[PDB]
């Protein structure tokens, strides 16, 4: 019952462990341990559900215990202890073999095999903790051990590849504890959280390990964002060393998400566009990844409306994220028609949903836009329109008010008109035709430069595969 | 043959609450008749939601009779030994018995064998045609599309002109259902001349459809040629209200009469668009298109008009005209600006190289986009 | 004007008929749009066959 299942689980882990142990110890085969470690994490998580998940208990029981032992005992303490074989070293079946670890030499201290195994064991523990929903004590305890555990060691290119996962859980777990409950302690420890991440980053510049840099920078942005500390984020971004070249595409998409958010709020919209479009394409369309996508579309809807664009209706017509994106859709509508009374009703009713995502603050600002789109409309239609008629239609306060809207609107040149005070009407001046202008050149410059970049990427990629198979034996 | 299409036409009426109560209950009688007669009990179940135990007994009986009959018939047709002739025929018949009671599922299995098993190309096309009709029946359009994509491969393989015609007319209906009217028109005009009906609607229906599309898409010169001077339309005159309304609208559009155009607009809505199943869903869309089109038509020939002149001509008040013009101006089709101070309707026309420049860049952004993503994919792989 | 005999515009409010030469649309721009259209279809087909790699 217990025995069989526990045993199989241990075997499975041991198999995995052996593969990566042979791999990591031979030269600079870096990519191989990295791909393998990733797959593994996935396999392990998938594993837990059936044939137990006391693999962790087993897996501790049959390895050298440096501090593993102390953690395991805490974990057992948490879910009410039991003893049945739950102290490590209770089965000696390493037997001073090199693969299961030379038992004596680990004790003598001439060599250290426990180092990399302990990082990997912390990953496995961490994953189980989050999967399980083992909060409070474990979470604190795990964090408390692991931070000084890593600062006890000295990093290598291979150790750097491993902590690129560990730092994600240190962050995430703390957030979960704020997310349980409000504590006075949570306000203090928030500060400590930032502090340890910041230190590790400085060193990691010196290791020139891109993997960890990228991971770290994303975590650090997310914290500033919750406290709405834009001024401090602005200087942070000016550091400029956030790598892209080596990094996985996920880290580029979280990074770009954050960039869109921070730019939009401090009243930059132009550049904020490039970043949100890019962040949608980089994200995959995975079934578990649908939650991310909705969130990205909420934000996009907003960015555009501020800028003065209309997201296609068509794009949202065939989407299935429908129920969540109902608030956003009605905003788009209000802007598109220029309808003044509609707008206000829309933001009062939906206020709470909008507040959660923190799109709300952007939504207040589209109030200037409602009016502007509605003046855009009257101009396209009419070449001379008495200002007196506009004052009734948009139910504007006084003759002075109607002038001032148009006055300010032409400063960004959205409407491009001329007001005649004395003649008491507006006369359209709009060029319309810009083919004649120099402008067509500029538009095409972007088109051509993007295109040329795609040819270069192709060349470089094409030759690499073919070398690998040609070396290999074949007909 | 007749119920296979006709049921859906009536049933649609029933669904709708747009329809007058007189019509709704005129159709109700028609539906009930054909249930009992074709023994539609499985399918009837589907329709009732969307809308005596003797019926049920009629199923249970007819089914077990029809089943036992065909069972041993088919069993014997397979037993005695030659598949080219008997086994192929027997599967056709099996699909047909499923298609009568509208079980979709068991027909896909039987008519699938027939296609797989080697037979004349004629023979293949003919059989597919039934599967497509069940898609049209069910009021699922994408089901029709996959089938008719295959049918199209076989069309020049077989080379029968007979089935090129039949294919055209099915694809014609599929396209009438989707927004896209451009392909519909091309297919539709040829088929006025030629199509012996097969498991699809009467030629009176088909006539009104060619007239409707013709307005929408066609250039002016080409409406006159192909439609008004149609040999077919002229001989067919009007023996139906629907055909009459659409005809009346065509004559004023071409003649640039505008006073009577608007009564006529209203008439076709009542007597054409709502009875027709496929064009019901596009009722709003059509009238929008037509109202832009007429205003447009008149503006093309005049650099200016006064508001009074234009409004008296269409037969609406000046106030009613103003609110309506301004709907369609930011969507760009009428190409006119409007002065309020001098009451004048100016008509700007600045379409030239500028027009065409904008079309090419917009569509261009899209080709770039697709390309980038497929590039990245493969490189990883 | 509707039949493109003389192609001009009648100005009702001056009592004049204005006359234009035949407009000549840019042939290059029209033929270019046909080519672009085609390129999309091409890429769709290719990609369906490239589904084999993944």
């Amino acid at each position: 019952l217990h025995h069989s299942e526990k045993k199989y689980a241990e075997e499975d882990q041991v198999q995995e462990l052996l593969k990566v142990l042979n791999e990591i110890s031979k030269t600079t085969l870096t990519l191989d341990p990295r791909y393998i470690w990733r797959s593994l994490k996935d396999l392990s998580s998938l594993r837990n559900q059936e044939l137990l998940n006391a693999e962790t208990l087993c897996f501790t029981v049959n390895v050298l215990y440096p501090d593993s032992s102390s953690f395991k005992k805490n974990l057992l303490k948490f879910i009410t202890s039991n003893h049945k074989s739950s102290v490590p070293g209770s089965a000696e079946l390493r037997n001073s073999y090199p693969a299961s670890f030379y038992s004596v030499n680990t004790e003598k201290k001439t060599i250290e095999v426990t180092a990399e195994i302990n990082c990997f064991m912390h990953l496995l523990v961490q994953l189980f903790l989050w999967d399980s929903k083992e909060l409070e004590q474990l979470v604190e305890f795990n964090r408390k051990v692991v931070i000084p555990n890593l600062l006890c060691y000295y990093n290598l290119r291979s150790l750097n590849l491993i902590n690129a996962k560990l730092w994600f859980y240190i962050y995430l777990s703390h957030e979960t504890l704020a997310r349980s409950s409000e504590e006075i302690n949570s306000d203090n420890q928030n500060i400590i959280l930032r502090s340890t991440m910041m230190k590790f980053l400085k060193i990691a510049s010196l290791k020139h390990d891109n993997e960890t840099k990228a991971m770290l920078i994303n975590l650090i942005l997310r914290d500033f964002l919750n406290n709405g500390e834009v001024d401090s984020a602005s200087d942070f971004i000016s550091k400029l060393e956030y790598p892209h070249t080596d990094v996985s595409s996920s880290l580029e998409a979280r990074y770009f998400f954050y960039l869109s958010k921070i730019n939009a709020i401090q009243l930059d919209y132009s550049t904020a566009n490039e970043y949100i479009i890019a962040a949608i394409r980089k994200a995959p369309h995975n079934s578990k990844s649908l939650g991310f996508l909705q969130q990205s579309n909420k934000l996009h809807c907003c960015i555009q409306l501020l800028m003065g664009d209309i997201p296609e209706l068509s794009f949202f017509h065939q989407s299935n994220m429908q129920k969540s994106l109902l608030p956003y859709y009605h905003l788009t509508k209000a802007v598109k028609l220029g309808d003044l009374k509609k707008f206000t009703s829309t933001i009062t009713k939906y206020k709470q949903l909008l507040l959660k995502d923190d799109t709300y603050q952007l939504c207040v600002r589209l109030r200037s836009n409602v009016i502007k789109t509605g003046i855009r409309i009257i101009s396209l239609t009419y070449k001379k329109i008495s200002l007196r008629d506009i004052c009734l239609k948009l139910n504007l306060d006084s003759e002075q008010t109607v002038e001032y809207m148009v006055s300010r609107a032409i400063r960004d040149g959205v409407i491009e008109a001329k007001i005649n005070h004395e003649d008491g009407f507006i006369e359209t001046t709009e060029l319309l035709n810009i083919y004649d202008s120099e402008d067509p050149q500029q538009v095409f410059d972007e088109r051509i430069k993007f295109a040329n970049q795609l040819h270069d990427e192709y060349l470089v990629s094409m030759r690499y595969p073919e070398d690998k198979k040609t070396q290999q034996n074949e007909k | 043959r007749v119920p296979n299409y006709e049921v859906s036409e009536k049933a649609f009426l029933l669904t709708q609450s747009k329809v007058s109560i007189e019509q709704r209950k005129e159709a109700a009688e028609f539906v009930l008749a054909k249930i009992k007669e074709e023994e539609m009990a499985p399918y009837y179940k589907y329709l009732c939601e969307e809308y005596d135990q003797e019926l049920y007994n009629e199923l249970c009986k007819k089914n077990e009779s029809k089943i036992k009959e065909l069972n041993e018939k088919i069993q014997k047709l397979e037993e005695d030994d030659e598949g080219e002739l008997e086994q192929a025929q027997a599967w056709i018949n099996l699909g047909e018995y499923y298609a009568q009671i509208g079980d979709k599922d068991n027909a896909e299995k039987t008519l699938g064998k027939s296609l797989s098993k080697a037979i004349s190309t004629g023979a293949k096309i003919d059989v597919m045609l039934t599967i497509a009709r069940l898609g049209f029946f069910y009021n699922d359009q994408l089901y029709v599309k996959e089938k008719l994509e295959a049918v199209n491969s076989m069309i020049e393989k077989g080379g029968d002109w007979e089935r090129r015609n039949r294919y055209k007319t099915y694809y014609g209906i599929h396209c009438l259902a989707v927004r896209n009217f451009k392909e519909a028109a091309k297919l539709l005009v040829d088929s006025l001349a030629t199509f012996t009906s097969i498991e699809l609607t009467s030629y009176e229906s088909i006539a009104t459809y060619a007239s409707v599309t013709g307005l929408f898409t066609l250039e002016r010169t080409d409406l006159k040629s192909k439609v008004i001077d149609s040999p077919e339309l002229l001989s067919l005159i009007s023996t139906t209200a629907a055909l009459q309304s659409i005809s009346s609208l065509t004559i004023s559009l071409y003649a640039s009469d505008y006073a009577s155009y608007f009564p006529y607009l209203l008439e076709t809505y009542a007597n054409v668009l709502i009875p027709c199943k496929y064009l019901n869903r596009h009722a709003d869309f059509f009238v929008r298109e037509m109202r832009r089109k007429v205003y447009a038509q008149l503006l093309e020939s005049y650099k200016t008009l006064s508001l009074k002149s234009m409004a008296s001509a269409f037969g609406v008040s000046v106030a009613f005209l103003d609110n309506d013009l301004g709907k369609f101006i930011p969507n760009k089709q009428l190409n006119c600006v409007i002065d309020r101070v001098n009451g004048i309707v100016e008509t700007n026309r600045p379409d030239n190289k500028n027009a065409q420049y904008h079309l090419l860049v917009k569509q261009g952004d899209g080709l770039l986009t697709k390309l980038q993503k497929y590039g990245a994919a493969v490189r990883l792989t | 004007i509707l039949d493109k005999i003389f192609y001009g515009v009648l100005d009702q409010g001056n009592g004049w008929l204005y006359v234009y030469e035949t407009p000549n649309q840019d042939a290059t721009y029209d033929s270019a749009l046909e080519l672009v259209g085609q390129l999309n279809k091409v890429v769709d087909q290719l990609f369906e066959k490239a589904s084999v790699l993944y």
Binding site: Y458, E466 | - | L46, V52
Partner: peptide
């Protein structure tokens, strides 16, 4: 071009797996 050369590689890997296996027998 990229895709084309890549089908050719996908074929080459299948060939290469099998050739290796047979070489084990030959040795």
């Amino acid at each position: 071009e990229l895709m084309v050369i890549y089908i050719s590689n996908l074929v080459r890997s299948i060939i290469a797996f099998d050739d290796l296996i047979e070489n084990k027998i030959q040795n």
